Amino acid sequence: SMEQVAMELRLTELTRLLRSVLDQLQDKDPARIFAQPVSLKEVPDYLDHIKHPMDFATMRKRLEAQGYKNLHEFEEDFDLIIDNCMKYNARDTVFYRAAVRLRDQGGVVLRQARREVDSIG
């Protein structure tokens, strides 16, 4: 149907905008601490601590399959990256501190992304 096509076009355009948001957020992680999944070979106990691991590569795979239906879903995955890190790692670590700085800088980006998603529809 044409209604289905129009909905698919909206999802495509949201995907475009979330790809630009993802790039901007990932630039706030210049150390690449959040680029890839925590390795279970290197951190064998990880899934005992963290029940829903997340990272920027995993988000990019979901995004390219158009798997984010709305901005809330995308934000949920970004908050997992930050919140997982801040639980597993202590305050005194470069990992925790990277997560704080990514949260603080990413808030700016997300505040305007929400206005754009609502504005464009």
UniProtKB/Swiss-Prot annotation:
There is a cross-link at residue 41 (Glycyl lysine isopeptide (Lys-Gly) (interchain with G-Cter in SUMO2)). Residues 9-113 form the Bromo domain. Highly expressed in testis. Signal peptide: none annotated. It comes from the Eukaryota. It is found in: Nucleus; Chromosome. Component of some HBO1 complex composed of KAT7/HBO1, MEAF6, ING4 and BRD1/BRPF2. Component of the MOZ/MORF complex composed at least of ING5, KAT6A, KAT6B, MEAF6 and one of BRPF1, BRD1/BRPF2 and BRPF3. Interacts (via PHD-type zinc finger domain) with unmodified histone H3. Interacts (via PWWP domain) with dimethylated and trimethylated 'Lys-79' on histone H3. Scaffold subunit of various histone acetyltransferase (HAT) complexes, such as the MOZ/MORF and HBO1 complexes, that acts as a regulator of hematopoiesis. Plays a key role in HBO1 complex by directing KAT7/HBO1 specificity towards histone H3 'Lys-14' acetylation (H3K14ac), thereby promoting erythroid differentiation. This is Bromodomain-containing protein 1. The chain holds residues 555 to 674 of 1058 of the full protein.
